[PDB]
């Protein structure tokens, strides 16, 4: 079980890594990658807190990261 996300604004991808956000876009973050980035606490509810994440857009198809500031966590599956 994964963490998902949901866009808050469009994001224009910067770096080679990131990822496109368009509005309503949700997204796929594995336990793993924040647990890896010393995350206990319970950030993921709060993803502003964290900065940025990385993680699959389910509706554009694509990996990459993204900012934490820019999603709403809407639960897990």
């Not at 368009?22 to 995350?39: P, R, W």
């Not at 993803?47 to 809407?74: K, Q, S």
Request: proline fraction near 3%.
């Amino acid at each position: 079980e994964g963490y998902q996300y949901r866009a808050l604004y469009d994001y224009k991808k910067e770096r080679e890594e990131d990822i496109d956000l368009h509005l309503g876009d949700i997204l796929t973050v594995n336990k793993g990658s924040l647990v890896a980035l010393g995350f206990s606490d319970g950030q993921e509810a709060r993803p502003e807190e964290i900065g940025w994440l990385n993680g699959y857009n389910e509706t554009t198809g694509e990996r990459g990261d993204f900012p934490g500031t820019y999603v709403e966590y809407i639960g897990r599956k």
